[PDB]
C-alpha cells in the first residue's frame, strides 16, 4: 500500500529514471492487482542489470542470469506472472523469450512444458505440438499436453487439428490416447472419436476397440 502510494514518485526527472525503477513499478502493480499496468511497465523496461548487488529484488533475475543470458528477462517475467496467476501474459513472454533467444534451451523448454500444462489455455499450440516429435523423442510432452487439451474438450476443433499434424505422429499419439480412452469413463464419445481417426487410417482397430468396450459394458 505504501509502495503503491509512492508509485508516482518512482517516475520523476529523466536523469533519475532507470529500468530498475520501472521494474519496481511493474512488481507494485502485480501486488496491488493492477496486472495490466504491470505488463506495460515490464514491456517498456528491460532488466539487463545482471550484476547489481544492491537490490534484493534483482536476485530472482540474477539467479537465472548466472545460468543464462538476456532472454532471461522475459523468462523471469514469465515466471513472475505464473507465481501471481496471470496466464495470458505469462505465455506471451515465454514466446518472447524463445524469439529473443544448448543447456539453456533444454532448461527453458522443460519450463515451457510445466508452465503451458498449468495454464491449459496456451496449450492450443498444435503446430508447436507437432514441432516437438519431429526434432526428437519428446512424444510424451505431446501425450500429456494433448490430454490437457482433451480436458478443454472441444472435440470437433480438437480432432480437426490432428489432420494438420503428421499421420505417423497422429497414429502414435491417438493410439496412446486410445489406450488412455480405456479409462472406463462414462465418456462413450471418446471411442467414437477414436473410430473417426481409425476411419482416416486402415480402420482395423475401431472394430477391436468396440469389442473391448462391449466386454467392459
Amino acid at each position: 500500500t505504501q509502495l503503491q502510494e509512492y508509485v508516482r514518485l518512482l517516475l520523476p526527472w529523466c536523469q533519475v529514471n532507470v529500468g530498475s525503477c520501472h521494474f519496481m513499478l511493474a512488481q507494485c502493480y502485480l501486488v496491488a492487482g493492477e496486472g495490466h499496468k504491470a505488463l506495460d511497465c515490464f514491456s517498456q523496461a528491460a532488466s539487463e542489470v545482471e550484476r547489481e548487488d544492491f537490490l534484493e529484488k534483482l536476485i530472482r533475475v540474477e539467479e537465472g542470469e548466472s545460468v543464462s543470458p538476456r532472454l532471461q528477462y522475459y523468462n523471469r517475467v514469465l515466471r513472475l506472472l505464473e507465481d501471481v496467476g496471470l496466464p495470458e501474459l505469462v505465455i506471451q513472454l515465454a514466446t518472447i523469450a524463445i524469439g529473443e533467444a544448448w543447456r539453456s534451451q533444454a532448461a527453458l523448454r522443460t519450463r515451457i512444458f510445466k508452465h503451458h500444462l498449468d495454464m491449459g489455455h496456451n496449450n492450443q499450440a498444435y503446430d508447436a505440438l507437432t514441432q516437438i516429435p519431429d526434432p526428437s523423442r519428446q512424444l510424451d510432452c505431446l501425450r500429456q499436453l494433448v490430454v490437457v487439451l482433451c480436458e478443454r474438450s472441444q472435440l470437433q476443433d480438437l480432432v480437426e487439428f490432428p489432420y494438420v499434424n503428421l499421420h505417423n505422429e497422429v497414429v502414435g499419439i491417438i493410439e496412446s490416447r486410445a489406450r488412455a480412452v480405456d479409462l472406463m469413463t462414462h465418456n462413450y464419445y471418446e471411442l467414437l472419436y477414436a473410430f473417426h481417426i481409425y476411419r482416416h487410417n486402415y480402420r482395423k482397430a475401431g472394430s477391436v476397440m468396440f469389442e473391448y468396450g462391449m466386454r467392459l459394458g
Binding site: 500500500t1 503503491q4 506495460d40 501471481v84 496471470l86 495470458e88 495454464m119 491449459g120 492450443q124 478443454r152
Partner: protein, 291 residues
C-alpha cells in the same frame, strides 16, 4: 443460466452501442474476434442468449482497447464494421479489411495508451489519453489536437448526448471536464472516471476502491462508497465492479456479490443492460442479471 464459450485469444471486451447492435468484440493478440449475440434458444426457453463467433479479424498486433463507430452497418450478410482501436505499439487506428487509419509518429502518443473513445458530431471524433501525459483529439479533413494533462490520462469519455464535452481521468486523481469547442478546462475535481445517464451524473473510481458520485451547491461528491467502475447503461443507480486478480464480481447500487466465476480480463454490459459479457483467460461469458 449463463452462456459460456471457450476463446483462443483474449484482451479487452466491448459491446456494440453506437449504431449490427447485438454483436461483441474481443480484443486479442492477433486482433479482434467479432461475435454475435443471438436471442434464440432451440429448447424454446427464451432469455437464453448465445454467442456466435462470426469471424476473426487479423491485424498482427495486440488490441488493448477498442470502441465501435456508429458508421458500422450490416448489409445483406456482409458486415461493414468500423472500429477505433488501440494497438501495442502505442497506435490509435481507425479500421474500415479495406483500410486502416494510423495515428502514430510525432503526432501520436509516445507512451502506453490507456483508453480511447469515439463520438459523432458533423464528422467523427476520436479522443485518447496516454501515459505520455497528453490527451489528443482526432477530428474526422484530418485535424488533430494535443493537450497536456497534469499526469497520465487513465481514461477518457465523451459527454453522452453532448459531443463537445468530454471527461478525462488523470492517474493522480484529477478529473477534468474538457470542452474542445470552448475554453479547454471547464471544470476540475480532486482506475477510471466516466459519465452516467444523459451525462446527468459523473463517477470517479480509484484502485483502492473508493468511489465518488457527483450529480453535476459546491463541487463536493454527493455520496461515496467502495473497484473500477463499470456503468449499467439504462439504470443510473446500478453500478458494477469486479475483482480482476477468485473472480469476484460485485453489483453495487447494501453490498451484493452476484457473480463468482478464474481471473477476469475485462467485462462490459449488454447494449440494453440484460446481460454482462465477461472475458476470462480461457472463456467468454454471458451472465443474465435481473434487478
Amino acid at each position: 443460466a449463463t452462456y459460456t464459450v471457450d476463446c483462443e485469444d483474449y484482451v479487452h471486451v466491448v459491446e456494440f452501442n453506437p449504431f449490427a447492435g447485438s454483436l461483441l468484440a474481443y480484443g486479442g493478440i492477433s486482433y479482434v474476434v467479432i461475435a454475435s449475440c443471438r436471442f434464440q434458444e432451440e429448447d424454446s426457453t427464451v432469455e437464453g442468449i448465445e454467442f456466435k463467433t462470426l469471424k476473426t479479424f487479423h491485424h498482427g498486433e495486440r488490441v488493448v482497447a477498442i470502441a465501435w463507430s456508429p458508421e458500422t452497418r450490416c448489409d445483406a450478410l456482409l458486415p461493414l464494421l468500423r472500429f477505433a482501436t488501440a494497438a501495442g505499439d502505442k497506435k490509435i487506428r481507425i479500421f474500415t479489411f479495406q483500410d486502416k487509419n494510423e495515428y502514430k509518429v510525432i503526432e501520436g502518443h509516445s507512451g502506453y495508451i490507456n483508453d480511447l473513445v469515439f463520438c459523432s458530431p458533423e464528422g467523427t471524433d476520436i479522443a485518447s489519453v496516454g501515459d505520455d501525459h497528453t490527451c489528443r483529439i482526432w477530428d474526422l479533413g484530418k485535424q488533430i489536437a494535443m493537450f497536456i494533462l497534469r499526469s497520465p490520462g487513465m481514461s477518457v469519455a465523451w459527454h453522452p448526448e453532448g459531443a463537445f464535452k468530454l471527461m478525462v481521468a488523470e492517474k493522480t486523481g484529477t478529473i477534468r471536464f474538457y470542452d474542445l469547442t470552448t475554453h479547454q478546462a471547464i471544470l476540475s475535481l480532486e482506475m477510471s472516471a466516466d459519465w452516467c445517464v444523459r451525462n446527468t451524473l459523473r463517477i470517479g473510481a480509484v484502485a483502492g476502491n473508493d468511489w465518488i458520485i457527483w450529480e453535476m451547491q459546491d463541487n463536493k461528491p454527493a455520496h461515496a462508497d467502495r473497484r473500477m467502475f463499470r456503468w449499467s447503461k439504462c439504470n443510473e443507480n446500478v453500478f458494477a465492479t469486479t475483482g480482476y486478480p477468485k473472480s469476484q464480481i460485485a453489483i453495487h447500487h447494501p453490498q451484493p456479490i452476484l457473480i463468482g466465476t478464474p481471473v477476469g480480463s475485462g467485462l462490459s454490459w449488454h447494449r440494453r443492460l440484460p446481460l454482462c459479457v465477461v472475458g476470462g483467460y480461457r472463456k467468454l461469458f454471458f451472465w443474465l442479471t435481473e434487478m
